[PDB]
Coordinates of all heavy atoms in Angstrom, one line a residue:
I299 N 0.8 -1.2 0.0 CA 0.0 0.0 0.0 C 0.8 1.3 0.0 O 0.6 2.2 -0.8 CB -1.0 0.0 1.2 CG1 -2.0 -1.2 1.1 CG2 -1.8 1.4 1.3 CD1 -2.8 -1.3 -0.3
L300 N 1.9 1.3 0.8 CA 2.8 2.5 1.0 C 3.7 2.7 -0.1 O 4.3 3.9 -0.2 CB 3.5 2.4 2.4 CG 2.7 2.3 3.6 CD1 3.6 1.8 4.8 CD2 2.0 3.6 4.1
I301 N 3.9 1.8 -1.0 CA 4.7 1.9 -2.3 C 3.9 2.8 -3.3 O 4.4 3.6 -4.0 CB 5.1 0.6 -2.9 CG1 6.0 -0.1 -1.9 CG2 5.9 0.8 -4.2 CD1 6.1 -1.6 -2.2
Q302 N 2.5 2.5 -3.3 CA 1.5 3.3 -4.2 C 1.7 3.0 -5.7 O 1.0 3.7 -6.5 CB 1.5 4.8 -3.8 CG 0.7 5.1 -2.6 CD 0.8 6.6 -2.3 OE1 1.8 7.1 -1.8 NE2 -0.4 7.2 -2.5
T303 N 2.5 2.0 -6.1 CA 2.5 1.6 -7.5 C 1.3 0.8 -7.9 O 0.7 0.1 -7.1 CB 3.8 0.7 -7.8 OG1 3.9 -0.3 -6.7 CG2 5.0 1.5 -7.8
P304 N 0.8 0.9 -9.2 CA -0.4 0.2 -9.6 C -0.3 -1.3 -9.6 O -1.4 -1.9 -9.5 CB -0.5 0.8 -11.1 CG 0.8 1.2 -11.5 CD 1.4 1.8 -10.2
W305 N 0.9 -1.8 -9.6 CA 1.1 -3.3 -9.5 C 1.0 -3.8 -8.1 O 0.6 -5.0 -8.0 CB 2.5 -3.6 -10.0 CG 2.6 -3.7 -11.5 CD1 2.6 -2.9 -12.5 CD2 2.6 -5.1 -12.2 NE1 2.7 -3.5 -13.7 CE2 2.6 -4.8 -13.5 CE3 2.6 -6.4 -11.7 CZ2 2.6 -5.9 -14.5 CZ3 2.6 -7.4 -12.7 CH2 2.7 -7.1 -14.0
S306 N 1.3 -3.0 -7.1 CA 1.2 -3.5 -5.7 C -0.2 -3.7 -5.2 O -0.4 -4.7 -4.5 CB 2.0 -2.5 -4.8 OG 1.4 -1.2 -4.8
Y307 N -1.1 -2.9 -5.6 CA -2.5 -2.9 -5.3 C -3.2 -4.2 -5.8 O -4.1 -4.7 -5.2 CB -3.3 -1.7 -5.8 CG -3.0 -0.5 -5.0 CD1 -2.0 0.4 -5.4 CD2 -3.7 -0.1 -3.8 CE1 -1.7 1.6 -4.6 CE2 -3.5 1.0 -3.1 CZ -2.5 1.9 -3.5 OH -2.2 3.0 -2.8
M308 N -2.7 -4.7 -7.0 CA -3.2 -5.9 -7.6 C -2.9 -7.1 -6.8 O -3.7 -8.1 -6.8 CB -2.5 -6.1 -9.0 CG -2.8 -4.9 -10.0 SD -4.4 -5.0 -10.8 CE -4.3 -3.6 -11.9
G309 N -1.7 -7.1 -6.1 CA -1.4 -8.2 -5.2 C -1.9 -7.9 -3.8 O -2.2 -8.9 -3.0
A310 N -2.0 -6.7 -3.3 CA -2.6 -6.3 -2.1 C -4.0 -6.7 -1.9 O -4.4 -7.3 -0.9 CB -2.4 -4.8 -1.8
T311 N -4.9 -6.4 -2.8 CA -6.3 -6.8 -2.8 C -6.5 -8.3 -3.0 O -7.5 -8.8 -2.4 CB -7.1 -6.1 -4.0 OG1 -6.4 -6.2 -5.3 CG2 -7.3 -4.6 -3.7
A312 N -5.6 -8.9 -3.7 CA -5.6 -10.4 -3.8 C -5.2 -11.1 -2.5 O -5.8 -12.2 -2.1 CB -4.7 -10.8 -4.9
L313 N -4.3 -10.5 -1.8 CA -3.8 -11.1 -0.5 C -4.8 -10.9 0.6 O -4.9 -11.8 1.6 CB -2.6 -10.4 0.0 CG -1.2 -10.9 -0.4 CD1 -0.1 -9.9 -0.2 CD2 -0.8 -12.2 0.4
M314 N -5.7 -9.9 0.5 CA -6.9 -9.8 1.5 C -7.9 -10.9 1.4 O -8.4 -11.4 2.4 CB -7.6 -8.4 1.2 CG -6.7 -7.2 1.3 SD -6.2 -6.6 2.9 CE -7.5 -5.4 3.3
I315 N -8.1 -11.4 0.2 CA -9.0 -12.5 -0.1 C -8.2 -13.9 0.1 O -8.8 -14.9 0.7 CB -9.6 -12.5 -1.5 CG1 -10.2 -11.1 -1.7 CG2 -10.6 -13.6 -1.7 CD1 -10.3 -10.7 -3.2
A316 N -6.9 -13.9 -0.2 CA -6.1 -15.1 -0.1 C -5.9 -15.5 1.4 O -6.1 -16.6 1.8 CB -4.7 -14.9 -0.7
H317 N -5.6 -14.5 2.3 CA -5.4 -14.7 3.7 C -6.6 -15.0 4.5 O -6.7 -15.9 5.4 CB -4.7 -13.5 4.3 CG -4.3 -13.7 5.7 ND1 -3.3 -14.6 6.1 CD2 -4.7 -13.1 6.9 CE1 -3.1 -14.6 7.4 NE2 -4.0 -13.7 8.0
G318 N -7.7 -14.4 4.1 CA -9.1 -14.6 4.7 C -9.8 -15.9 4.6 O -10.6 -16.2 5.4
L319 N -9.3 -16.7 3.6 CA -9.8 -18.1 3.4 C -8.8 -19.2 3.7 O -9.2 -20.4 3.6 CB -10.4 -18.2 1.9 CG -11.8 -17.6 1.7 CD1 -11.9 -17.3 0.2 CD2 -12.9 -18.6 2.1
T320 N -7.5 -18.8 4.0 CA -6.5 -19.8 4.2 C -6.2 -19.8 5.7 O -5.9 -21.0 6.2 CB -5.2 -19.5 3.5 OG1 -4.9 -18.2 3.5 CG2 -5.4 -19.9 1.9
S321 N -6.0 -18.7 6.4 CA -5.8 -18.6 7.8 C -7.0 -19.1 8.6 O -6.9 -19.7 9.7 CB -5.3 -17.3 8.3 OG -6.3 -16.3 8.0
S322 N -8.2 -18.7 8.1 CA -9.5 -19.2 8.7 C -9.6 -20.7 8.5 O -10.2 -21.3 9.4 CB -10.6 -18.5 8.0 OG -10.7 -18.6 6.6
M323 N -9.1 -21.3 7.4 CA -9.0 -22.7 7.2 C -8.1 -23.3 8.3 O -8.4 -24.4 8.7 CB -8.6 -22.9 5.8 CG -8.2 -24.4 5.4 SD -9.4 -25.6 5.7 CE -8.4 -27.1 5.9
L324 N -7.0 -22.7 8.6 CA -6.0 -23.2 9.5 C -6.5 -23.2 11.0 O -6.2 -24.1 11.7 CB -4.7 -22.4 9.4 CG -3.7 -22.6 8.3 CD1 -2.9 -21.5 8.1 CD2 -2.9 -23.9 8.6
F325 N -7.4 -22.2 11.3 CA -8.0 -22.1 12.6 C -9.1 -23.2 12.8 O -9.3 -23.6 14.0 CB -8.6 -20.7 12.9 CG -7.6 -19.6 13.4 CD1 -7.3 -18.5 12.6 CD2 -6.9 -19.8 14.6 CE1 -6.4 -17.6 13.1 CE2 -6.0 -18.9 15.0 CZ -5.7 -17.8 14.3
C326 N -9.7 -23.6 11.8 CA -10.8 -24.6 11.8 C -10.1 -26.0 12.1 O -10.7 -26.9 12.7 CB -11.5 -24.7 10.5 SG -12.7 -23.4 10.3
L327 N -8.8 -26.1 11.6 CA -8.0 -27.4 11.8 C -7.5 -27.4 13.3 O -7.4 -28.4 13.9 CB -6.8 -27.4 10.9 CG -7.0 -27.7 9.4 CD1 -5.7 -27.4 8.7 CD2 -7.5 -29.1 9.1
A328 N -7.2 -26.2 13.8 CA -6.9 -26.0 15.2 C -8.1 -26.3 16.2 O -7.9 -26.8 17.3 CB -6.4 -24.6 15.4
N329 N -9.3 -25.9 15.7 CA -10.5 -26.1 16.4 C -10.9 -27.6 16.4 O -11.5 -28.1 17.4 CB -11.7 -25.2 15.8 CG -13.0 -25.3 16.6 OD1 -13.0 -25.5 17.8 ND2 -14.1 -25.1 15.9

């Protein structure tokens, strides 16, 4: 985000969705 290049946002927005379904998957395994 702090770099502000048009390429970084493409990965930043993707990581928000990537992390939200993978770490939550990991917590379900812990549960």
Side-chain angles (χ1 to χ4, degrees):
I299 299 306
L300 301 162
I301 301 158
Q302 282 178 288
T303 46
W305 271 81
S306 62
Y307 287 92
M308 301 279 180
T311 49
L313 270 163
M314 303 285 264
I315 309 152
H317 187 67
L319 282 155
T320 51
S321 61
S322 59
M323 168 57 203
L324 284 157
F325 277 122
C326 286
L327 292 168
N329 188 29

